[PDB]
Structure formats: C-alpha cells, structure tokens
C-alpha cells in the first residue's frame, strides 16, 4: 500500500485547487444579464502578482477613476479596500462565522462580500493579500493576462503577495501547498517503492526562486498564451523538482504520489511560495 497517500493529497493540485494557476478563470458568473469569467481556485497562490507592461503603475493601485490606474478597488465609503487584517476582524466582529477566519480566507470572503448587482449574483471579486503590511486588496479587475498589456508572474516584488479567488477554502493550510520541500524529490509510488518521475522537462534555473518562477509560467492556465474549452480544471505542468547542485528545474505535469529523500533536491509547485522551505 501507499503510506504517502494522506500526505501527498495537497499535491493533487487538480483535486485541491481545481482551476488555473498562472491564469485562473475556472468559473463564470452573470452580472446584469451578461456572463463574465471568474477566478475559482480553491488554493491561495503564493507570490503571484500582475506585471503591467509599458506603464509604471503597479497593479495593486486603484483602478482608474486608464494607464494611471491599476487592478484594485477605488476608494469607497466606508473604505473597504484596501483593509488591514485587524480592520477586517473589527469589521466582522459580530459575525462568528467570519471574524476568526485565517487572513487569506477572510480576505477572500471580504472581497466576496461585495455584490455588484445592486438581485443576488454569483460574481465575487478575486483578492490579493499582502503579508508585508497585512493588507487585503480587493481586485476590481479579474483579468490576469493581455498580450493595456499585462501578464501574471512570480517576482521578487510579488513574493509577499497572495492571489486569492472567491473559492479559497478555509482549511487551505491543511490541504493546500505553501512551502517547498527541502531534501525531497517528487516521485511516483510503484509496487511498494517510490520511483522517479519517468519523464521530466529540464529547465535551467539559478536558484529555487527561479525554478518556482518557471513552474508557474508553465502551470495550469485557463487562458491560451498570447491571447468552456479554455478551462484547465487544474491540469498542467504544476510541479517541479529542483536540483540545486545541477541547477536544473525538472518540470512535469502529472501529480506526484510520494517523496524521495535526496539532499540535492527541493520539491516545488506553482502554488508554493517561491522562497519558504520546510
């Protein structure tokens, strides 16, 4: 039998995330008669942000009230975005089902609390939580790539950012990946033994960060590169074994089912934080 089953559950990204990672647009929702694409991943995406080309405006800046505006909610009364963690807990202090949620889930629910159809609609905005200043940013624009030209990426500037869809589960800490696995190599459990991934796509990478960056670029995407049939439902090159000695990022698109002990390797995924190890 496979003793890795329970442990490896969080790396069945297709099952626990269930949507795009690089570009998450796994659901649709109607607003005033018109259908719109929507992020719907169940796991947070650590280190993911949006790079705005040509323009010098960062994407956490409020949307234009176009090149001078970002992706986030404009000022409101009362100010709902951006809102600190303590601000959110205070805002929902009378709601016992919400006030004690973890910062990422709370941020997801907070953004999902704002109904644009002012009838009930299913449209809930995605959100970014910035661990740096503990702020939740509600994203007014759900788009993630257009090549107003922009694209998603892991980046040093985005390492404390966390991209959150409306479906972020409240137990992501338990069932979703975050940290990279040090001295460990993803593998496939076969006949009572953990075997290597039989086929991988080798990309050179200077460090773990650059490997995680590459895995993200090649990961599940709900929108074809260079701009429903487009839904990945979590399928893609979501995993990577990084050999830190040979500086090889070994990227593959089948779920791992066990770990191999190897001090030359670090196990990463597209969802995982680009720095943190355990």
């Amino acid at each position: 039998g496979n003793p890795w089953t329970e442990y490896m559950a969080k790396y069945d990204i297709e099952e626990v995330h269930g949507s795009g990672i690089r570009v998450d647009l796994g659901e649709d929702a109607e607003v005033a008669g018109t259908q719109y694409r929507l992020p719907s991943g169940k796991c947070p995406v650590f280190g993911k942000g949006i790079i705005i080309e040509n323009s010098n405006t960062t994407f956490l800046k409020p949307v234009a009230t176009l090149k001078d505006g970002g992706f986030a909610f404009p000022p409101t009364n009362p100010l709902i975005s951006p809102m600190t963690l303590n601000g959110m807990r205070d805002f929902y202090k009378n709601n016992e089902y919400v006030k004690n949620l973890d910062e990422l889930t709370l941020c997801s629910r907070h953004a999902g609390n704002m109904n644009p159809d002012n009838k009930n609609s299913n449209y809930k905005y995605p959100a970014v939580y910035d661990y740096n200043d503990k702020k939740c940013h509600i994203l007014y624009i759900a788009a993630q790539e257009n090549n107003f030209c922009f694209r998603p990426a892991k980046d040093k500037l985005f390492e404390n950012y966390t991209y959150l869809s409306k479906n972020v589960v409240d137990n992501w800490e338990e069932v979703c990946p975050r940290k990279n696995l040090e001295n460990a190599k993803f593998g496939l459990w076969v006949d009572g033994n953990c075997e290597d991934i039989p086929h991988v796509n080798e990309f050179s990478a200077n460090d773990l960060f650059e490997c995680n960056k590459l895995v993200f670029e090649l990961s599940a995407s709900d929108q074809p590169k260079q701009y429903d049939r487009y839904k990945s439902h979590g399928k893609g090159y979501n995993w990577g074994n990084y050999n830190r000695e040979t500086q090889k990022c070994e990227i593959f698109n089948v779920k791992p089912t066990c770990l191999i002990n190897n001090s030359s390797y670090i196990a990463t995924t597209a969802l995982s934080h680009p720095i943190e190890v355990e």
Binding site: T76, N77, I80, N95, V98, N113, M114, N115, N118
Partner: peptide
C-alpha cells in the same frame, strides 16, 4: 456602488 451579501446588508459606494 455595491451591496454586502452577509448580514447586516449595507451599501458601499
């Protein structure tokens, strides 16, 4: 303007 889904419902403009 938006309307909160969770009670108590309010409007945010």
């Amino acid at each position: 303007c938006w309307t909160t889904r969770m009670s108590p419902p309010q409007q945010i403009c």
